[PDB]
Nucleic acid binder design. Structure first.
Lengths: 246, 129, 157, 56, 106
RNA sequence: UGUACACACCGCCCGUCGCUCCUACCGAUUGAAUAAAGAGGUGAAAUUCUAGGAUUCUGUAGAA
RNA sequence: UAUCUGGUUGAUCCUGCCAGUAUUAUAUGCUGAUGUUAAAGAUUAAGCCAUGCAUGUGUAAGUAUAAAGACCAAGUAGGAUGAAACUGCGGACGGCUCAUUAUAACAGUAAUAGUUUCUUUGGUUACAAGGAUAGCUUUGUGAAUGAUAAAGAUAAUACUUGAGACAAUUCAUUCAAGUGAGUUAGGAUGCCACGACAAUUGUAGACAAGUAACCAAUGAGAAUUUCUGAUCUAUCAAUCAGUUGGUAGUAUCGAGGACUACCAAGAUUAUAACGGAUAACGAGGAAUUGGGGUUCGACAUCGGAGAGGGAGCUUUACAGAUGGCUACCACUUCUAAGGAAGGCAGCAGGCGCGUAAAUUACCCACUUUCGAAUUGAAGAGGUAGUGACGACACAUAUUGGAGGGCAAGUCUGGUGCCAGCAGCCGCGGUAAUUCCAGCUCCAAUAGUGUAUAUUAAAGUUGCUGUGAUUAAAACGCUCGUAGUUGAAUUAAUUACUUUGAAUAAAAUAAGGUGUUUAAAGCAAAACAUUAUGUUAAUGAAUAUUCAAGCAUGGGACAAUGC
């Protein structure tokens, strides 16, 4: 290829979209933005399959372009907007406020929320750097560059964001007494407690996460996503409560 | 055009390389522009990704800096007296990085070695030995 | 590969084309079941051979192996609804002791016989192929319907 | 009949009509062997403007 | 060379000794495309230019009828049997004849 | 006891020479050619630099 | 199904091969009721192409007196709508093919503290100026191309100047906190270059919309690069001179002998370098398999390369683009004979080639992409036609054979070692169980033989696993480097072994699910006798996966020096 690609073959699509192998030749390529290609669910797949509002792509463009979807506080009108992690999705017409969390089946799930709890959304800091003119800033897992932050908001914490205001409500550190949700590989979509983080200077940082039922499973530091403090969850966990049945 | 791939070179064992594909623009090279001494003339080359390189063809002046006195002053270059790489650069007075050039200290009132890339940045900037 | 829809073979031919000891044994069942040709015998033989291979592979592992408990019950469960294996035999060893009469005796042409609708097993085909028979709520005309235990008392005209 | 989905955005209702033998959409019907029962999807657009605009 | 680290000789022994296979070497060395009048073809199209009668081998007496056929790809000449009884009458000259091996593999 | 014999020594069997056909090998000889990768000579074309400045714009100065 | 049988002899036991057998993929003979699914010009020529289509795009939000707005409807800055043209975006995706290519590419893995755009997302930074230009008008030529000439005007979110007041680039000096690790993000000093948030747009869908740079995302992306891994050949044993390294520079988006100048003589090789062959694109995978394996992979999907052969370039964020341009080599087309375009390894179709392979059909409704954007386009995609390549269920008739291998005739006529049959042994010289026939019956069945090739058989290629006195096969014998193999013993790495981490799908095994069953598909339904809830329904943990790479528990068996 001489440049960036535009089509996406059905079989090259991420497995966790559950697209029928005989559905069609191509799959909806998610446009760029906040969430990566394999970390996001395109907005078309959320409505055609998860919610079954629209049977085909004819009736998906008739909705998203109709200003009838509010991804986070703002409103998006892109048919293939990348809808990723717990970034809230709201439909004022039907009066429902979903949210895209993971679950134990390595799948994005639409956890229903109330109106009040949909006004906020948790973000995970990715990095903190000093800007020119000594203007420090932090980058969340949504690609957001938040302005002048708290001095203690370090690289791998978790912050609380407000849709209406945009400020930072509460912030959770990264320690051995916090509840974390998993966004990774085998441990994907599992809730647990950080108990041990063994450090290897060379390549990766390995974190041992103890489940509620005493199950212990390790992972890479990248996949860890702190969800609360002191065995408390800041959001309504999915139906299976982040528990895995052997 | 000039190419910068390694597909035209011999292996570490001396064995010849057998070609598979034709030339490509990624490994594109370009002709040198030996910035001689003369009147001001630069050209804007449209490089990859649209970025613009100032290609100094001939220059006369440069913003020389003095480390000891913490002063940088413009000056007119006189003559290229030494090049560490090619002595033929001295004869043609070609201006490249590291060329030892003598200059008149008229604003210094208040010997040089170039420390910039005239063929890339588009101007001569140096310091005083 | 070229096509996306999967395909499979339902039977295999015998390795030795010409045996008298096999022509009589296979013709014993053809009369006993009114089958159209020798493909039906091979298909039933092919079906059994798959289950026997699962039990055969699984008997080589420990009883506390996670795969033995899960897959082992799955095969016994599947057989139980089909009714090939008697319920009181609930071990993987009894799978290997299955024969080719167990599978053929649960076919629709066999079931309508012993229940009494069809006088002769050749007469059962016409009734079955004529859609005269019904299984619960759906008309059936494939004489190869492997009825389950639940659908055993739900076979009427 | 069967499952009914209320669609306000498309101003329609998605219901799977089961047949046990200008504002509506009748499509996607497949019977059983030899006739008898037939299933299908029923779409109702209430307003005629919907059928006037919400049709491919 | 049965040792644990002796996989280099164990492999070189098999590469060399496989060339003594009268049958495996035949389908690998480059003569099927030059010496074989058929190549990898299953059949061949040719032209008749002579009708031959081949006397049988020692324990038989008779005349096995045959023809001389020149192909269209190689251009070589090959003697072709006539399959059935009295089938030489139906053959002619300057006509296309399909040629497909025999019971034995060439 | 030896056997290469079992139609069993009236057995079997070797080599040159003669007939027909087939296959590969060498090959004075215009033998002998065809198609593929290097050294030297000529070398279109487009780009890089240099000279040019027909035209036209501000009313020769300058820019193209 | 971890399987064999006929054939060397008067007879016996062997080595040993030939023939037999089953399966897969190609053609072909004979024959053919159905319904489901489905390959199809790859092998031979990446050979040559007539003809038709395959890439265009408009919203209230760039420019519109078209003498278009009697077709809505009025109209004094132009009513909503607006062909055409400028402007913006795109044709660098998709689609086809497999010629090149033997550590190259590709697969897993790691780096980019050695580079990085486009789209998209978060954020930061004078009540208004200037020229010309198309569509428009007029005059024209040439046979002609998607042909082109002058003049007369007229717009911008096209091209410029200019303000409402920093950022980023180079150099020299200096202070300095995350990270395994940075004179590093960042700040300070001094000149240099660049220097804005359209001098912008809806009257209706103040709020949109738009723009210029700079940080961060999208990027796990792209591009370079680290480690390990490839078929046959020694009738290929030595190979390389920008070659190996260093310094300075040059060029590039960027490291780098990538290139140039100077200096040194280095780099690879028996652990197979260098060269040769390929009917060689690589992988996921396919066929067959008791285990071990053997063969195949142009072709769904991913990566690479190409557009008749090289070369050279333009545009733009990405092309060394070819359904873009220039030249040469080789072809094809129109011609008014002056000249002009063209690149089916796109979709149909034609010639040729061969054993060998489909309609010059319809539609963007499914999937998805492109666009000024809900509306247009798409030979992508879907539908339809041909289709005994194959696969599944299922009517009531052919194919091959009748000595043995191998199920089936001590039936009747001719031929008389002739015709012939015959995969192998063999049958036929006048009483043929085999020939050519007639009747009878054996096997399979809408299938059944042939020819070629792959696998099993083949313990007739041997790791599991062969043979070498006599059947084929121990060098004439000794010395010997590389290689392989090495006694007992002890109360820093590697190798080995166990757990993970990470790991595209399709495919394999597999969990569920009555497509009438089955192949299939990932759909649906027990059920609420159903809008309500089971329901926020299922999506197999789907296990793997060899050779490398990361971490960890153990130190018996091994390896490397102190």
């Amino acid at each position: 290829a001489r440049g960036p690609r535009h089509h996406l073959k059905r079989l090259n699509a991420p497995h966790h979209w559950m697209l029928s192998k005989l559905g069609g030749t191509f799959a909806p390529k998610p446009s760029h933005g906040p969430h990566g290609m394999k970390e996001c669910l395109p907005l078309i797949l959320i409505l055609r399959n998860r919610l079954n509002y629209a049977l085909n792509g004819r009736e998906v463009t008739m909705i998203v372009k109709n200003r009838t979807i509010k991804i986070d506080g703002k409103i998006r009108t892109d048919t293939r907007y990348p809808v990723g992690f717990m970034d809230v999705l709201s439909i004022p017409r039907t009066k429902e406020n979903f949210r895209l969390m993971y679950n134990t089946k390595r799948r994005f799930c639409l956890v229903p929320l109330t109106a009040e709890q949909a006004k906020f959304k948790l973000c995970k800091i990715e990095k903190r750097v000093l800007g020119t003119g000594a203007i420090p800033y932090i980058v969340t897992h949504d690609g957001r560059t938040i302005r002048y932050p708290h001095p203690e908001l370090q690289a791998n914490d978790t912050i609380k964001l407000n849709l209406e205001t945009g400020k930072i409500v509460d912030f959770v550190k990264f320690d051995i007494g916090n509840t974390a949700m998993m966004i990774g590989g085998n441990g994907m979509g599992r809730v647990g407690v950080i108990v041990k983080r063994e450090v290897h200077p060379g390549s990766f940082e390995i974190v041992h996460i103890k489940d509620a039922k005493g199950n212990t499973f390790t992972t890479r530091l990248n996949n860890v996503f702190v969800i609360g403090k002191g065995t408390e969850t800041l959001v309504n966990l999915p139906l299976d409560k982040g528990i895995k049945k052997p | 055009g000039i190419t910068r791939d390694s597909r035209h070179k011999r292996r570490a064992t001396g064995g010849k390389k057998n070609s598979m594909q034709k030339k490509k623009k990624n490994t594109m090279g370009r002709q040198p522009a030996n910035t001689r001494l003369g009147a001001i003339r630069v050209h804007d080359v449209r490089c990859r990704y649209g970025i613009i390189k100032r290609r100094a063809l001939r220059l006369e002046n440069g913003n020389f800096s003095w480390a000891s006195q913490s002063i940088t002053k413009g000056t007119k270059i006189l003559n290229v007296v030494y090049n560490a790489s090619d002595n033929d650069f001295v004869r043609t007075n070609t201006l490249v990085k590291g060329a030892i050039i003598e200059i008149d200290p008229a604003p210094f009132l208040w010997l040089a070695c170039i420390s910039s890339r005239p063929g890339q940045t588009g101007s001569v900037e140096g310091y005083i030995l | 590969g070229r096509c996306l829809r999967n395909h499979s073979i339902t039977y295999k031919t015998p390795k030795v084309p010409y045996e008298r000891e096999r022509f009589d044994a296979e013709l014993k069942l053809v009369g006993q079941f009114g089958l159209k040709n020798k493909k039906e015998i091979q298909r039933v033989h092919y079906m059994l051979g798959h289950m026997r291979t699962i039990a055969k592979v699984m008997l080589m592992k420990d009883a506390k192996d996670p795969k033995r408990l899960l897959e082992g019950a799955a095969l016994l469960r599947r057989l139980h609804n089909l009714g090939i294996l008697p319920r009181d035999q609930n071990k993987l060893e009894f799978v290997l002791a299955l024969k080719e009469e167990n599978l053929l005796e649960r076919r629709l042409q066999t079931l309508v016989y012993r229940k009494g609708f069809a006088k002769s097993i050749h007469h059962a085909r016409v009734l079955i192929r004529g859609k005269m028979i019904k299984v619960g709520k759906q008309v059936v005309d494939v004489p190869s319907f492997l009825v389950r235990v639940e659908s055993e008392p739900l076979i009427q005209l | 009949t069967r499952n009914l989905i209320v669609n306000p955005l498309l101003c329609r209702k998605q219901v799977v009509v089961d047949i046990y033998h200008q504002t509506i959409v009748l499509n996607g019907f497949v019977t059983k062997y030899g006739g008898g029962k037939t299933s299908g999807f029923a779409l109702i657009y209430d307003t005629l403007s919907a059928l006037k605009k919400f049709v491919p | 060379a049965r040792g644990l680290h002796a996989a280099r000789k164990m492999l070189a022994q098999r590469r060399a000794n496989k060339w003594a296979d009268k049958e495996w070497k035949k389908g690998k060395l480059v003569t099927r495309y030059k010496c074989n009048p058929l190549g990898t073809a299953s059949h061949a199209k040719g032209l008749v230019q002579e009708k031959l009668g081949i006397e049988t081998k020692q324990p038989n007496s008779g005349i096995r009828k045959c023809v001389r056929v020149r192909l269209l790809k190689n251009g070589k000449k090959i003697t072709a049997f006539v399959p059935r009884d009295g089938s030489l009458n139906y053959v002619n000259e300057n006509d296309e004849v399909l040629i497909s091996g025999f019971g034995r593999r060439g």
